[model samples]
Target: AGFLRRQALVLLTVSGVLAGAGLGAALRGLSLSRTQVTYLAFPGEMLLRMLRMIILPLVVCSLVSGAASLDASCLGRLGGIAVAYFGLTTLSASALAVALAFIIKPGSGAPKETVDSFLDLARNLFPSNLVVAAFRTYATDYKVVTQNSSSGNVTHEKIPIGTEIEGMNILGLVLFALVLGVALKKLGSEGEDLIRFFNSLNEATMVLVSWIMWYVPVGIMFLVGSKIVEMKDIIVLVTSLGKYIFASILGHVIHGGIVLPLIYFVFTRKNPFRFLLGLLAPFATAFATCSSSATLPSMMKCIEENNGVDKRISRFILPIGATVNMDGAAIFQCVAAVFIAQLNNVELNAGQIFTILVTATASSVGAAGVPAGGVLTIAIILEAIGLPTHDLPLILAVDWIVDRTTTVVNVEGDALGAGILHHLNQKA
Candidate 1:
C-alpha cells in the first residue's frame, strides 16, 4: 500500500489488462448473451464519458492559459518547433515503412474507400455553431441513387450530402482557443483577469484528473475484457495478417522505443529512457483506452509532474500534438500500403514510394486537424498512390492491435517534444 501512487497506478492498469484478457479468453468458453457482453463493457463506457466530459474544458482552458502566459515571440517559436517535430517524425516513420515492408514482404491487405471531405473539415475549422461543435461535428456523407439516364442502362451515383455526427470538433475548438489566448495576451494588463481565470480553471481540471486516475484500472479491465470477448474471429484475422502485423509492431518499436529517444538524447543530452520511465501510467492508459484524446489528461499530469516538463510547454504542445501529430499513423499507413501492393502483386517504382512518403507525411498533419483523426489518412494516402483498397479489410481487421502502439508513439512524441522544447527554452 505504500508504493508510489503513480507507479502503482501503472502496475494496476497493466494487471487489469492482463486479467481482462484472461477473463475474456475464459468467457469465450461460456455462451454469453450480447447484452451481457454490453453490460461487461458498461463500466469502461463510463470511464470514457467521464474523460470526454472534461476534455472540452481541459483543452480550452489549458491552451488559452498556456498561450496567454507565454511571451508572444516564444509562443510562435514553440508552435513552429512542435509543427516541425511532427512533420519530420512522421516523414521518417513513413520512410521506414518501405524498408520494413520490403524486408518482411507482408503483401498485406483490402476495403472500400472513404472519400474524406477536406471541405467539411475546413468548414469545421471556423465552426458555424461553436455550441453544436462541442457535441457534434459537420460530416460529408455520400448516398447512392439509382439512375437510368441512358437507354436500357442502369447506373448508380453516390451524391455527396452534409450532416452532423456525434463527435466533438476538436480542430475548431483548438483554433478558437489559440486565437483568443493570443488576443488576450495582446490586450496588455486588461486581459490578465480573463487569462488568470482560464489558468485557475485549468488547474482545477488537473486536480479532477488526479482524482480520476484511481478509477482507470477498474475501467481498463472491463474495456480490455469486453473487447476480447467480442473478438470471435480474431484468430483467423491474426493468422492471415501475422507478418503484416509483425512489421507494423516492429516499426512502432523502432520509432517509439528507439528513434524518438535518440532524437531526445541528441537534443537534450539527458536520459531519455528515464524520462519515459515516468510516463508508464500515460502509456498504459493509451494502450487500454485506444483514444489519444482521452489519454491527454493523464499524459499532461505524468509529463508535468513526473518528467518535470514545464506546464506551459506541455499544456500547449500536448493538446496540439494530440490533434495533429501522427508519427505512428504515418509508419502504419506506409507499411500498410506496401502490404496492399504486395497482396495484389503490384510492383512499386521509385515514384510510388515517393508518393506514399509524401502523402503519409502530409496526410498525417492534415488528419491531425480533422475530428476523425487518423481514419482518413490511410484512405487518403492509398488513393494518392493508386493502391487498390479492396484489401483494406486486412489492415482494418488488425487495427486495434496496431492502434494501441500507434497511440503510444503519438503521445510519446508529444511528451518528448514537450521535453525538448522545455530544454531549448531553458537555454534561451
Candidate 2:
C-alpha cells in the first residue's frame, strides 16, 4: 500500500492526462495555424526521435548481455521457461480476442471499402540478404517471391514496407544475439572482455533511458494533443469505431487485468492485487510512453526493488519479454483483424479465424517495441488470411491511442512473467 502512494506517478499521470485533454479541447475549439500545430508537435516529435535512437542498441545490447550472462545449463531451462510462458500466454490472448470479437461484433458499423484495389502482400520468413537485413530501410519496396512450381518457376513480387526494415528482420537480430550469446558462453575467459563491454553499454543505455523519462509527461501530452488535433473528424470516427474500441479495450482489460493476474496467483500462490500494485511505476510509464522497450528500465526497477525478483531473472526475462512477449499485441491484432474483415463485409469462416489465431500469436513476437509497431504487423496477418490490407489505415488512425493501452498490457505481462519465473526458480 505504501508503494501505491508514490507522488511522482500520480503527478506524471495527472499532468499528462489533464494537459493533453485540455490542449485537445482547445485545439478542437479553435483553428490552430500550421505553424502553431508544428510548434506543438516539436516536443513530442523530438522525444519520439530520442526514444527511437535508443531502441536498436538497447534491444541488441540488452539481449546480448542478458543471454551471455547465463550459464549454459541454466540458460537452457530459463530459455525454455521464457519461451513457453510467452507463447502460451500470447496464444491464449489471441483466442480471447477471437471470442470477444464474435460476441461484441464491433465491426457492424465499420465502413465497407471496395476490394478491387486491395492486393494482399506476401510475408517473408527470412531475409534474402543479411547485409540488407541489417541496414533495411523502414520505408522501401521489398521483394517477395512466389513459387510457381516448387522447382523451376519462382516469381518475385514487390510490396511497400513500413517501419520494419526487413520483414522478420527483428527475429534475425534476435537469432544473431542468441547465437552470439551462446558462443560467448562457450568462450569463457576469452569472451569476458566483450561480455563486460556489452554489460557496461547496457547500463549506460538505461541511464540514458532514465534521463529521457523526465521529459515523458510533456512529450506524452504533446503527442496526445497533436494527434487529437490532426484527426479531421474525431467525433465521427470515434462514434463509428466506438464498439471496435470497446472490444479492443475490453479484451485487454480481461486478459491483462484479469487473466494474467489469475495466472500469477495460480502459479505463485501470491496475491495478484498486491503484485500489480507493486509495479505501478512501470504500468504508468508503459501507458504514457507506449513502448515496452521504453518502459524496460522502469519495469526492471519495479520488479527488482518492489517485487523482490532476482536481478538475473529480471534482467534476462524482462529484456527478452520486451522483445518477444506481446500478449496485449496478440489480442489487439487478432481482434482488429477480425474487426477489419467484418467491416469489409468479408465473412471469415472458422478456419480463417484459426489461421489468424496462429499468425497473430507468432507475428506479434517479432513486433518492435515502438509506437505503431503492432500496426505494421497487421499487414502480415491480413495478408496471411487473405484479408484486404488497405483497410489497415483505419486501424492505424486509432492505433496511436490504442497502442498505449496494449503496451501497458504488454509491459505488465512481462513483469508478471518475471515474477512467476522468479518464484519458480526460488523454489527450485
Candidate 3:
C-alpha cells in the first residue's frame, strides 16, 4: 500500500486512460447525436482549453527567464550551434522521405506544405508586429486563378500565396522572448528589474500547471472515451489501413530506436539506450494522453530528475521544442498520404510529389501544440496534392493506436534534444 500510494499519479493517469478506453467501448453501441456526445467530452475539452490558455504565459515567461540567466557563452558557443542545427536540419531533410514514395509511387497531415510555408517558418520565427503576434501568425495561402483556355472554358490554378491563420503565433513569441531574454543577459544587473518581473510569472505558471495536473486523469478519461464513441466503424476501417499503419509505426521505430539515438550518440558519445531508459515516465505519460503539450511538465521532471539534464537547459530548450518539432508526425503524415492515394487509385504526378514532401515537412514542423492532431493536419496535405480528405474518418478510427506512438516519439524527441543541449553546454 505504501509503494502503491507513492505511485498514485502515474497509476491514476494510466488507469484513467485504460478506463477511458473501456468507457468508450461500453458507450459505442448508442445511436448518439454529435451534440449529445459532445457533452460527454466537455470535461476533457475544458482541460484542453485551460492548458492552451496557460501556454502563452508558459512559453513567454519560461523562455525569457531560462534564456536570461544562462551563461550566454554556453548558448553562444559556436560548436554547439553547428551540432544543434545539424540535428534539426538532418530531421528536416529526413522529412523528404515523403517525396520518394511517389517514385516508388503519395501527403499534409495541414499548414499547406507550400514553399511559402517554409518561408512562414522563418517569418514567424521573427515576427515583425509583436502585438498581432499574440493571436495570429501568417503562412502559405492560396487563391484559385480562373484562367480562360483555348476552348473558352475556365480552369483554376492554385497560385502559391500568403494569408493569416488563427492560433497564437507561439514560434514568433518564442524568438521574441529569446531575444528579450538575451537582452536581459547582456544588460547584466542593469536590466534586472524586468528579469525579476518575469521570473515570478514563470515559476507561478509552473505551479499553476502543477495544480492542474491533478485534474488531467479525469479529463483524459473523457477525451479518450469520446474519441472511441465517435469512431463508429472502428473495426472495419482500422483493418482496411492496417498495412499503412504498420508502415508508419515501422518508420517511427527506425526513427526512435535508430535515428534519434544516432543523433544522441553523435554529440554526447554516451549510450543513449541507457539514457532513454530513464525516460519511461515521460514516454508513458504521453502514451496515456496523446497530448503534445500535456506531457510538458512530466517531461521536464523526468529529464531533470532521472536523466540528470542540467536544470536550466531542461527548462530552456524543452518549451522551445514543444511547438512543432514533431519528428514522428512527419513520418506518419507521409505514409498516410500514400495510404489514401493507393486506396483510391489516385496515382500522383511529379508536381504532386514535390507538393507532398515540402508541404508535409513544413506543416508537420510548423503545426501548433494540440491534441488529436493527426486528422486535422492531413487535410492540408490532401488539398495540397489534390487528394480527397474523404478517408480521414477511417484514419481517425486508429488514431488511438498511432497517435500514442506519435505522442511517445514527440515526447522523446523533446526530451532527447534537451539532453543533447545539456551535454553540449556542460562540455563547453
Candidate 4:
C-alpha cells in the first residue's frame, strides 16, 4: 500500500484493536500502575485538549458566518426544514436502537454487580465548576472506578448545566464571533469580503485537522500496539459477555443503520444507500473512537466530500449536532434502561415506561462527547426513572465494542441530517 493508504490502515487498526484492548483491561480489573495510566492517557488527553481549545471559536465563527451570510428568506425556509429533519432523524434512530436492544436483550445473563462507590465519588467528577467543565473534559485525571458496589445499584449523577453556552464556555469567544459575523453581514458587499475572510479561516482550520490526522497511524500504533501485549482481560470479556455485546451492537446497527435510513428515506426523496456509503468512513471512525466529538472532524469531512453540504452550512450545523445529536446513544441508553429494569425484574406501568424513554433521550443530549459518555448518560437516564445507576459497569465490560458500533451510527445520523439540510437549503 501507498503511504496514505498504509497510514489509514495503521490508524484504523490501532483505533479498533487498541481501543478494544483498553476496554478489555478495564473489564478484567487489570489495574494499571498510576504511571502507566498516565502514560497511556497523556497523548490522548493532549490531542483532546488541543481539539477543545479550537471548538468554541470554531463553532461560533462557523455558525455566525454560515447563518448570517445566507439570505433571510432562504435561511428561514432551510432552517425549518433542517431542524425538522434533524429532530426526526434523531428520534427515529434512538427509538429503533431501544426497540432492537429490547428484542435482543444484550445484557441478559450478565452479572449485575459493579463498582458503585467509585461512581459516587466520581459523580461530581466534573470541575464542579462549569468554567472548568467548559474548558476541559473530565477524562483527564478523573477517577471513580471503585465507588460502586458489585450488585449494580448505583444512582446517577451529572453536573447540571444549560446547553446554550455549551459550544464554548468562554463568553468572549462566542460574543466576538457573533458580533463580527453580524457586523460583517450589515456591511453588504463589505460583508462579502469578510465572509471570504472567515471562509479562509475555516479552510485553515480544516487544513490543520488534515495535518493532525497525518499522525493517525503513529498515534494509533503507540496506543494500540502496546495494548495488544496487555489484552487478556478483553478476551475474557468477549467470551463471558459475548451475548450482551452482540445484542448491544445488533441493536445499534438496526436502529442507526437500518431503521434510521428507512425513516429518512420515507420522509425525504433522498436515497438511503448513497447516504450510508458516503458515511462509511465516519461511521467506522465513530465506532473506533466511541466518541462523537472525536469523530466530528471526520464527520464534517464526510459531509462536505460525500454528502455535498455547503461548507458554511456544514460548519454551523455539525458542531451543534455533535454536542446535541445523541440519536444512536439515546437509543442505547433507553434499551439499556429497559434491559436493566427487566434484569432486575422491576415492574413499570405505561406512564413510567414513557418517562424512561423521555429521560433516556434527554440524558443522551446532555451527555458529553467523550468515550463511554453513553454509560454516564445511561446512569443519569436510569436515575431519572428511579433506577439505580450501579449497572453502568455491567455494560461497561462490553462498552468498547458497543461504543464503536453506536458511534458509527451517530456519525451517519450526523451526515444524514446535514445532507437533508443541504437538500432543503437548495430547494428553499
Candidate 5:
C-alpha cells in the first residue's frame, strides 16, 4: 500500500471523530432541535440503508466465488480449519465473559424491567419461509421514546413505521450459498459462466464499497452529532450500568486485544500489531458503521489488498466469519445473561451456567451482523436457561454503547482468522 493511501484511512477516522465532536459540542450549545438534526442526518441514514442494500448480494457473490475458487482437495481442509478456529475462539470468548461476569457480579442490584413486547417477536428465530427470508432485511426494530417539550410528556414511536422489510435468517443465506458453491464445483464446464458472473458482481460490489467509504466520514459526523444531541438523562443510566459496562468492555479488551492477537502470533509468528494495522480500514469501518455485514465489502478489500491474504481465503472465510464468527458477541451474550439473571434475583447453578456458555456460543454464530444484533439475541439465551426475558430492557438500554467495541472485536476476529487460515493453507 502507498503511504498516502494507508494514511488515508487514519485521516478519515481522525477527521470523522473531530468533526463529530465539534458538531456535537456546537449542537448542544445551540440547543438544536431533533427535527433539525434529523434533517442533517438524512444522508447518514441513507448511507446506512445503502450498505444494507448491498450486503445480501455481496455475501452471496463473495462466498460463491471464493468457494468455487477452492479445489476439491483443499475445500475440506479449509472448512475444517475455519470451523475449528472459529468454534474454539467463540467458546473461549464466551467462557471469559462468564468468568468475568461472575467475578464482577455486575448484575447484583441492577435495575430490571419487563419487555413483554419482544416475546412474540422471538418466535421467528428460525426462518419461517426461506423465500421470504431472502427478501427480508434481517434486522430488529425498536421504538425510540423521546420527550416532546411542547407536549410536556414522553412519546414513543417507531420512526417511519412500515418502512422496513421483514427480518431474514442470515444463517439460512450462508447455508444456501455454501451448498450452491459446492454444487457448482461438480458442474465443471457448465458452471463456468455462472461462476464468472458472480466473480464480476463481487468485484463490482467492492467498487461500490470503495465509493461508499469516501462519504463515510460525513455519515459518521452527522450520526455522532445527532446521537449526542439527542441523548438525555444519560449520566444516571451510565452510572447504573457502570460495572456491567466495564465487564463487557473488559471482556472484549482481553479477547480482541490479547487472546486473538496471541493466537495470530502463535500461528503466523508475525507481529500482531502489523496484522492489526493491516486491518485498520476494516476495524474503523466496523466501528463507525457498527454492522459487520455492512463492513464486509471493505473487509474483503482490506484482507486481500492490504494484508496479502489469498483472495480465496478472504472471500470464503471472511463472509462466513462476518455472519458466524462472532467471538465478541459470544462474550457480550454471556456477560449480559449473567447480569440479567443477577438483576432478576435468579440463581444460576452449574447447569444453567453451562447452558449460557453453550447457547451463547451457538447463538453468536447465528447472530446477524446488523447493529444491536447481539442484544437482540439475548432473548434466546434467557429463554434457554429459563431466565427472565424481560431483563432484556436492561441490556437494550446500553447495547448501543457496548456495540461499538464489540463490533471492532468481531471484525478483528474475522480478519485474524482469515490470516491464520491463509498461513495454514500455504503450509498444507
Candidate 6:
C-alpha cells in the first residue's frame, strides 16, 4: 500500500509538472519559435536519425535471420501471432480513439478556415506514386538529411516527379522487405554462412538499440517540456482536447498497460505487474517521442530481458510489429478521421464508418515510423471517404499536441505483445 501510494504521488507530481508548464507557457507566452523548437528538437531527432540510418538493414537482417532460423512449425506459429496481434490491437485502438474523441468533441466550434486548410492538405496527400511515397517518408528525418534529391535520379526512374505522396503506403516497403528477406533465405547451403552473418548483425543491432534507448528518459523529459511550453495558451482548446487526448491515451494504457497484461497473465500465468514494469520505460519513451520506430531498439531489449523471449520469437515478431502493428496509430487515425467528419458537419453512414475502419486498419498496417503521422493516417482515411486530402494540415497543428498520447499507446501495445507472442510460441 505504501509503495502504491508513492507510485501514485510520483505520477501525480509528473502530471502536475506537465500541466503547470503548459499553463505557464500559455499564460506567459513562452512559446518557442519554429527555429527554437527545432533547436530543442534536434538532439533527439538526431538520435532517431542514427537509429533510422540503421532501420532498413535492421529490419531486413532481423527478419531474414529469424525466417532462416525458423522451423516450419515455428514459422507458422509466428505468422498466426503476428496477424492476430496486429488485427486485434488496430481494432481496439480505433474503437477507443473514436469513442473518446466523439465524447470530448474537440472539433466543436473549430474555425471554418482551419477546417478548410486541413482538407486541402488531405487532398494533396492521396494517390501518390508508391516508390516516391516511401522515399518521401524520409522527410520525417528532417533533423538530418536536408534534400531528398537522392530519390530523383534512381535507376528505376530517370525523370523526377512532383506528384502527391500517399501517407499510408508503407505496405509497399514491408512487402519489399519481405520479398528480399525470403529471397535471401532461399539461397540454401551456400547462403547459410551469409544468413548467419546477418543474424549476428541483427543481434548487434538489437544490442545497439538497447544501448541507445537508455537515453530515452532524457529525451522524454525534453520532448514533454518542449511540448508543454508550446501549448500553454488557449484553455478551451487545450482543456477540451486534453480530455479527449487523455481518454484516447488512457485506452492505450488500459489496453496495453493493464488490460493486455492482465490477459497475458491469465493465459501464461505470469505476473502481469512484472510485464508492465518491464515495459514502462519503453512505453514512456514511446509516449514522449510519438514514433514506434524510434522505440524499437529499446522494446527489443525489454522483451529479451523481461519476458524471456528467445531470438526466434523476438526477431520474428518485433521487426514486423515495428512495421505493421500500429495499434496506437490506428486509434489516432480513426479518431482523427471521425473528429474531422464531425467538425465539417459531415455525417458518416454505417458504410462510411466501415470503410473508415478498413482503410484505417490498412493505414495502421502501412504506417511509417515518423513525424506528421497524423497527416499521413488522415490522408488514407480521407481518400476512403472520397474527400479531398487538403484538410490534413488542420489536424497537423494539433498533432504534436496529441501524438505523444498515441505514441505511448502504440509503444505499450508493442511491449504488451511480447508476452502474448512468447506464450503462443511456447504453446506451439
Best by TM-score: 2
Candidate 6's C-alpha runs over 4 A off are 1-74, 109-244, 278-290, 388-390
Better of 2 and 6 by TM-score: 2
On lDDT, who's better, 3 or 5? 5
Ranking by lDDT: 1, 2, 5, 3, 6, 4
- State the weakest 10-residue window (summed lDDT) of model 5: 111-120
Q: Clashes in candidate 4: how many? A: 16
- Clash totals for all models, in order? 10, 0, 7, 16, 1, 18
Q: Which ten-residue region of model 2 has the weakest summed lDDT?
A: 113-122
lDDT of the candidates, in the order given:
0.67, 0.66, 0.64, 0.56, 0.65, 0.57
CA displacement after TM-score superposition, residue 217 of candidate 3 (Å):
1.8
For candidate 5, write residues 1-428 as lDDT tens digits.
57877658648755775778586776344656666665876866676565556656765677777767655465555476677777888888888778878887774743222233233233334456667766563333454555353365446444322233544545445556767888887777777888888889978876776676677566666665665565544564466488888878988898777887777778786666666577666677778886667767887676576775776666665665577677677777777777767767766556446645765665554436666666435754554444434334345545667778788887777777777878877777
TM for candidate 4 is 0.49
Candidate 3: segments with Cα more than 4 A from true spot: 70-128, 139-164, 236-428
Best by lDDT: 1
| TM-score of each candidate structure, all chains considered together | 0.52, 0.55, 0.53, 0.49, 0.53, 0.51
Give the candidates in order of TM-score, highest first: 2, 5, 3, 1, 6, 4
For candidate 3, give the lDDT of residue 305.
70
lDDT of 3 by residue, 265-291 (tens): 888887766775777666776788778
Q: Decide which is better by TM-score, 1 or 6.
A: 1
How large an RMSD does model 4 have?
13.2
CA displacement after TM-score superposition, residue 276 of candidate 4 (Å): 5.0
Residue 295 displacement in candidate 5 (angstroms)? 2.2
- Residues 85-116, candidate 4: write the lDDT tens digits: 66666666556656666666543443122323
What shift in Å separates residue 241 of candidate 2 from its native position after superposition?
A: 1.2
Please write out the lDDT profile of model 2 over residues 1-428, one tens digit for every residue.
67666658537755675778687877354755787767766776576457556546755777778778555566455567677777788878888788888887775753222232122212223455656655542333444565443565556444344445423345435556768887887866876889889989978877776676577666666666666676655665566587888878888888877877777788788676676677666677678876678657887776666776777767655665577677777777787787777777877556456556766765664546766666546765664444444334346546767888787887777777778888888888
Clashing pairs in 3: 101-105, 102-105, 108-381, 109-377, 109-378, 110-377, 113-359
